[PDB]
RNA sequence: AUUCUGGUUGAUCCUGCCAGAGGUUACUGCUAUCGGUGUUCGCCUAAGCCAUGCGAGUCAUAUGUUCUUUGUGAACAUGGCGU
């Protein structure tokens, strides 16, 4: 593998060894091969295979959309769809582009019941939407699990995050706009303005 | 577990209901060993109609009469209480 950009080069030489200092560095992650050696743990899931289409003069133009989500299961998780003529280069293209979206979300314990500390919930009340489907992300008590549909419970268990309510509003069908908006919540879960004294 | 899934589209987002998915209640198809708990089993139609037995009777230290199995034993009556 052939590095291209200078986070590339600073990962090969050595200099930027997990995706945090990466992000310090503050350039364009932009190779799919960077993430990988960062983080070689990096899990990933399909979320739904919708074989999208197209109109042409003479048939019609098939594709998939099928969009694979990204986390570790401790902090970090990322978003990442792609599509191509067959299921096969469409998934690995998917997997290209969520690696490259990996970010990094604080935890706690925020709950009016529970009371650990220790980061095992969302830190407070956020919020995600993506097209009309919206999710707010309400701390839980320790021990309890993701209150949450099983590609939410799939999206925040590789996000890592482990106890949650919720709830959903506008066409929930969609589950591309599900895994986007239960992206958005968490990238707001790191975005709220917190005191000094906390 | 403060839960989502399919359906209108060539394909998408979506408003929108439809249907899916869990209780409880009533009834019921199929079907079947047993015990425990108690505060269920002609309510939902007919508060329709009823054969049969029964469900409130008791009083000898209230009065009165005949027996005896001689004893707060029974039968009758007036009467008290209760229904
Ligand atoms: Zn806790």
Redesign the pocket.
């Known amino acids: 593998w052939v590095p291209k950009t200078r986070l590339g080069k600073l990962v090969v030489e050595g200099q930027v060894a997990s995706m945090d200092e990466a992000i310090k560095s503050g350039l364009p992650i932009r190779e799919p091969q960077i993430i990988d050696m960062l983080l070689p743990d990096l899990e990933d899931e399909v979320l739904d295979i919708?074989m999208?289409?197209?109109?042409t003069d003479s048939g019609?133009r098939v594709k998939f959309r099928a969009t694979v989500i990204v986390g570790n299961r401790n902090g970090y998780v990322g978003l990442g769809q792609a599509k191509d003529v067959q299921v096969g280069p469409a998934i690995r293209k998917a997997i290209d582009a969520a690696k490259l979206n990996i970010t990094y979300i604080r935890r706690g314990c925020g709950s009016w019941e529970c009371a650990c500390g220790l980061p095992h919930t969302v830190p407070y009340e956020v919020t995600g939407k993506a097209?009309?489907?919206s999710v707010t992300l309400?701390p839980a008590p320790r021990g309890?699990?993701?209150?949450?549909?099983?590609?939410?419970?799939k999206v925040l268990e590789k996000a890592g995050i482990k106890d949650v309510?919720?709830?959903?509003f506008?066409?929930?069908?969609?589950?591309?706009?599900?895994a986007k908006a239960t992206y958005d919540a968490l990238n707001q879960v790191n975005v709220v303005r917190l005191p000094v004294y906390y």
């Open positions: 919708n999208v289409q197209r109109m019609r097209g009309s489907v309400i309890l699990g993701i209150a949450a549909g099983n590609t939410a419970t309510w919720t709830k959903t506008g066409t929930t069908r969609s589950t591309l706009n599900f």
